[PDB]
């Protein structure tokens, strides 16, 4: 019990505070299990819109949306599923998503033909660097940490040079340039 719960709490919080970017629909799937866990099977009597504080069931970037109807619907989808069997599922849904176990940063990429930068999620692990869609969350690109030649940072930018001719560099708008530079560095020197 105690071990299963450490992981559940870990996965949960990393989602509620937005450390693990997930797409709406899933946040509500999670919330669904979160209700099964904290309340027990659904009760179409008590469990109706307004019966929940959505600030402690979802990523700040969805509390607004008001998908309280989505959560109870997913809640309902758990029948009489145990508090434990739900914790499990939630932890398997948390791992099945690529964004799982990555350390993102919000970056602003300049896309050709449009002066208007398009917010993006930058992901980094001890093995790769991925490009993740701000809203949808679906990765768009992926690079091996071992193909990183050098990086650079400034109080308002970050750039990664793989040494890939055609593509060139990957520069972005960021205030976290010195932290994203620190991470990678730590990782790289662990991986020869």
């Amino acid at each position: 019990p105690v071990q299963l719960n450490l992981l559940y709490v870990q996965a949960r919080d990393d989602i509620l505070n937005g450390s693990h970017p997930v797409s709406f629909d899933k946040a509500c799937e999670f919330a669904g299990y979160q209700c099964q866990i904290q309340f027990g099977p659904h009760n179409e009597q008590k469990h109706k819109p307004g019966f929940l504080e959505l600030k402690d069931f979802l990523p700040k970037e969805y509390i607004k949306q008001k998908g309280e109807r989505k959560i109870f619907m997913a809640h309902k989808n758990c029948g009489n599923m145990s508090e434990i069997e739900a914790k499990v599922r939630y932890v398997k849904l948390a791992r099945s998503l690529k964004t799982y176990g990555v350390s993102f940063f919000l970056v602003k990429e300049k896309m050709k033909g449009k002066n208007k930068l398009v917010p993006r999620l930058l992901g980094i692990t001890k093995e790769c660097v991925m490009r993740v869609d701000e809203k949808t969350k679906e990765v768009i690109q992926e690079w091996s940490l071992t193909n990183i030649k050098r990086w650079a940072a400034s109080p308002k930018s970050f750039t990664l040079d793989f040494g890939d001719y055609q593509d060139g560099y990957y520069s972005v708008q960021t205030t976290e340039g010195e932290q994203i530079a620190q991470l990678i560095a730590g990782y790289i020197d662990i991986i020869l």
Binding site: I148, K149, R150, W151, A152, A153, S154, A181, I188, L192
Partner: peptide, 13 residues
Amino acid sequence: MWDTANNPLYKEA
């Protein structure tokens, strides 16, 4: 402003 990985793919090894 560069910080290289001194990665064997590039650095002369």
